Paper text:
Influenza A viruses are categorized by their surface glycoproteins including hemagglutinin (HA), which binds sialic acid receptors on the surface of a host cell and mediates fusion of the virus with the host endosomal membrane. While only the H1N1 and H3N2 influenza A subtypes currently circulate in humans, the H2N2 influenza virus poses a distinct risk. A recent phase 1 clinical trial investigating a ferritin nanoparticle vaccine displaying H2 hemagglutinin (HA) in H2-naive and H2-exposed adults enabled us to perform comprehensive structural and biochemical characterization of immune memory on the breadth and diversity of the polyclonal serum antibody response elicited. The molecular details of cross-reactive and strain-specific monoclonal antibodies (mAbs) isolated from H2-F-vaccinated individuals were revealed by high-resolution cryoelectron microscopy (cryo-EM).
Unexpectedly, in addition to RBS-targeting mAbs, we also observed cross-reactive antibody responses to non-RBS head epitopes. Particularly, antibodies targeted the region between the conserved central helix and vestigial esterase domain of the HA head, termed the medial junction. Though this marks the first description in influenza A viruses, antibodies to a similar epitope inhibit release of progeny virions of influenza B viruses. In an H2-naive participant, we observed recall of H1-reactive medial junction cavity pAbs upon first exposure to H2. Additionally, it was able to neutralize pre- and post-2009 H1N1 pandemic strains. These results suggest that H2 vaccination can induce memory B cells generated by H1N1 exposure that recall antibodies to the cross-reactive medial junction cavity in H2. Overall, these studies identify an unappreciated neutralizing epitope on the medial junction of HA, which, following H2 vaccination, is targeted by antibodies with potential for broad reactivity and neutralization. We use cryoelectron microscopy and monoclonal B cell isolation to describe the molecular details of cross-reactive antibodies targeting conserved epitopes on the HA head, including the receptor-binding site and a new site of vulnerability deemed the medial junction.
Residue numbers in the entry:
A (entry chain A): 11 to 54, 54A, 55 to 83, 83A, 84 to 89
B (entry chain J), G (entry chain L): 1 to 107
C (entry chain A): 281 to 325
D (entry chain B), H (entry chain K), I (entry chain F): 9 to 171
E (entry chain I), F (entry chain H): 1 to 35, 35A, 35B, 36 to 82, 82A, 82B, 82C, 83 to 100, ...
Write the structure that this text describes.
């Protein structure tokens, strides 16, 4: 009749680095770094950006004749140039 | 003395609507702007502490933001209990000032 | 959160997408991976 | 815990395995596991909590004759980024080392707790386990796991079986 | 919890000195290192700051009233006090005491009034 | 190892739509988070970029050809595709697919084309 | 569109000599410049990734550097296998562009 | 040291408690306590020594058309403050963890020192204490605390009392 | 390992010394030494790897009426230098402490490995060494160092010599 002392193991392939050892396989881990993105311009909390299209800021404010479509844009969440 | 000007002096909106109250400082006061809610007959309650942060106990419907001189108080989903005067206070200089206040009526 | 290369749907403290941002964003860090271990060394037997 | 863990243990991080006439099996030590979980969870949260939120920041344009300003502005941004990258990576490496050391300590401590209770009522094997010198049923196995083992109760059976 | 309570006559005659007291409880005006404020509200008007006193007895006043206002503090009883000499009709107001708290920020401590008391209405008449 | 292989007819008649496919292997176009490019080289000329597609199906095009170019992606088969409507003599070129990789840098991710495929020559004639 | 101009359009040099190929951007593209080597009949090979770094597998004889608009590709100790067209690519904007290319002949 | 410390011990951090026919009492282990004090004192001083003195620094005024400079100046100040706040807080958390671990090690080491000297002349209790198998007066209690205990001297009395 | 190291040991960091009828001597424990070397080497390299290369950087001239820019430029350079000096020195102090603790653990672990194999076939001395209760030649000395010691083989000789 016996009693043995031990610990958990699984099929995880997650690895971490430590100061003394690299590529250590562990049973559980946390990713602190985000690397995905939605490669589009989104509304922020419901509000659309002002896109300047082919216009520079100077074009937009002086009223370059070709920045006509912006003369009626009174508000925005951000400006994209 | 740094003057604080609120606008509008009075605003009415229905329940569930969005209320925006703004305040303009005569001088750059950085992040030193507090907002208060005054129910009739009571001492003012603190809503917003840093220009952008809430006091614990304040409903999440309240928010705000601002820069040097231009600051905003916003109430999302306005409720009947939000009937109050609202005040803009600067804590940058010593002669502390409040704006004239905005009265928010419901409906 | 919006960066020039796309929007970010994340609650993590760091990002490696772009330094320019508008909104409530993770801090930009120049790294490929940043991971903590919470469990045990995975050595079965 | 010597020569690897138990893939058959699924209810915790640390625990026990036993064999007797009533059948063998595994069970987690919940006090050890939950204390380990709470410690590690607080640590991960501290790493996150000490790094603040990034707020809106955009670049600046400079003129042809403002190159010195352009270069200082860039220098400041690159400097701060290089510093925060350093801090984020160093903190993770330092804590990953401590986490693993923490866990090794916790399993070793269960072993010693059991060793202390059993004394002369079991043979130490040398592989992180003990062999009883007395017959032991499920109730005494639970007692050892609980930390309530009655040594005197079996000391006579043990001395006779030890020889 | 922190509570402030104002008290005073509620009625002062012209040319008399008005004197109000605020008792602080659930806090300590000898330990916190905070500023203690007095403010007032004239009926129909917004809020006006009167002045404040610190733990070291350092006192500041709203410059438009500095020649009339006296503010003091007794740590033994946790009490603040306000006195206005030469009181007139213009001084009818609800007077409040308040605690000024802070959180360190960029640019220094960012101060705010959190505990405001109840408010004591003082009428000036004869 | 990562390999890309282009394939298509090699001959299209004028006014027909050209359609090329690139099969990606040793990688996954549903997991990497990379951009997938199409480029071409007219004989005797340097390289011209056609466009790219991301993992989310987000597609961009060289603005001089945007009205003619369609780019798509099928994750189930690891395949990319390119279609050019109204094909003419000017479109004779070697077409290539490429993977765009990155390393984070100051200023954001610094992108490059590393795996370029082999190249498919397409002649436009009748 | 950001234009990339390479110079010379053609260069010849003997084996063991030093070859310098330069490229000028019409706009500031910071460090977003790649260099490619194209052998006749083949897809271009990546040599230089960041303006100053090499792709693994690229011989140490290749190097480069640059700032905002002015970039250089250098080949030390030119070998016969380095006969190729070389291209300057910017990855800063979306309408990715390549320079016209430089043909490097040997001897 | 098991189940809490001794509020009756006031002359040090680590020490011993004893009971015999001449009367019980507490005494600190000065070598352990003083080594622990010196270690911790050096550590606190290192934290202070590596942070430099703040020298006079005041703000700057900017014109209406110098907003880009104003914003860079602020960015630099906020960046440095955020970095130093991070460093100061992290260093304190890291050292507070080590301090407590340091102290637990030191008390455990006294236990083992005593255990080693006593060998078979005392029963291990399991609560961080030992029971003698021989009569022991104040002189042998001091000898054990000193690290000079004579095991052979009492080995005969012990084997007879052990049975 | 108690009261200092062996200047007579030159083939490693950790090891054994023995005495028997065939002659005494020292030998390193290569598994312990090489694991310790690899750990420490990786650590030194991590310190170097996380600090980047300094690239060309030169100063700037400012005009008489550009004092505010001059002062900001200097502020930025001094700030970054003060931060990196702090980080470099702190990292070295933190790792030097861990290195020494690492090494003390490794020698203590060899002791316990030997203690575990010998059990009742040797007397524990208390100075980091063991005395056999049986005659032991070079082959059994090597077996203990290897971790292959046959306890049962000498248990009869030992009980007779122990008395
Ligand atoms: C930019 O100009 C071209 C040519 O006139 C036009 O076709 C295109 O729609 C313009 N872009 C935007 C965003 O308006
Ligand atoms: C991503 O977006 C979904 C909604 O589309 C949301 O439920 C999820 O929590 C978001 N994710 C994070 C922070 O991973």
């Amino acid at each position: 009749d016996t009693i043995c002392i031990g610990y958990h193991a699984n099929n995880s392939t997650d690895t971490v680095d430590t100061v003394l050892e690299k590529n250590v396989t562990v049973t559980h881990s946390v990713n602190l770094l985000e690397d995905s993105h939605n490669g589009k311009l989104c509304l922020l909390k419901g509000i659309a950006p002002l896109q300047l299209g082919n216009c520079s800021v100077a074009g937009w404010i002086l009223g370059n004749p070709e920045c006509e479509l912006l003369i009626s844009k009174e508000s925005w969440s951000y400006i994209v140039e | 003395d740094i003057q604080m000007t609120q606008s509008p002096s009075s605003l009415s909106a229905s329940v569930g609507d969005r209320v925006t109250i703004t305040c303009r400082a005569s001088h750059n006061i950085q992040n030193f702007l507090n907002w208060y809610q005054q129910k009739p007959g009571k001492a003012p309650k603190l809503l917003i502490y840093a220009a952008s942060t809430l006091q614990s106990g304040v409903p999440s419907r309240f928010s705000g933001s601002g820069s040097r001189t231009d600051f905003t108080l916003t109430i999302s989903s306005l409720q009947p209990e939000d009937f109050a005067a609202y005040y803009c206070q600067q804590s940058y200089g010593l002669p502390r000032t409040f704006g004239q206040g905005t009265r928010l009526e419901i409906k | 959160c919006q960066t020039p290369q796309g929007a970010i749907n994340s609650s993590l403290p760091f990002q490696n997408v772009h330094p320019v941002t508008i909104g409530e964003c993770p801090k930009y860090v120049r790294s490929a991976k940043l991971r903590m271990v919470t469990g045990l060394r995975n050595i079965p037997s | 815990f010597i020569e690897g863990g138990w893939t058959g243990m699924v209810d915790g991080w640390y625990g026990y395995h036993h064999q007797n006439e009533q059948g063998s099996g595994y069970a987690a030590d919940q006090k050890s596991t939950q204390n380990a979980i709470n410690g590690i969870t607080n640590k991960v949260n501290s790493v996150i909590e000490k790094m603040n939120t990034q707020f809106t920041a955009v670049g600046k344009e400079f003129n042809k004759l403002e190159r010195r300003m352009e270069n200082l502005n860039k220098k400041v941004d690159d400097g701060f980024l290089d510093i925060w990258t350093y801090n984020a990576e160093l903190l993770v490496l330092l804590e990953n080392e401590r986490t693993l050391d923490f866990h090794d300590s916790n399993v070793k401590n269960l072993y010693e707790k059991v060793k202390s209770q059993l004394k002369n009522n079991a043979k130490e094997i040398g592989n992180g386990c003990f062999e009883f010198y007395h017959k032991c049923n499920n109730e005494c196995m639970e007692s050892v796991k609980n930390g309530t083992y009655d040594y005197p109760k079996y000391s006579e059976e043990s001395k006779l079986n030890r020889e | 919890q922190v509570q402030l309570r104002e008290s005073g006559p509620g009625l002062v005659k012209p040319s008399q000195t008005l004197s109000l007291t605020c008792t602080v409880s659930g806090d300590s005006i000898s330990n916190g290192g905070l500023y203690w404020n007095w403010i007032r509200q004239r009926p129909g008007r917004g809020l006006e700051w009167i002045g404040y006193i610190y733990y070291n007895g350092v006192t500041t006043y709203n410059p438009s009233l500095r020649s009339r206002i006296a503010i003091s503090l007794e740590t033994a009883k946790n009490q603040l006090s306000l006195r206005l000499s030469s009181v007139s009709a213009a001084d009818t107001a609800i007077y409040y005491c308040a605690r000024e708290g802070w959180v360190p920020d960029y640019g220094g401590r960012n101060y705010y009034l959190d505990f405001w008391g109840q408010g004591t209405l003082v009428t000036v008449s004869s």
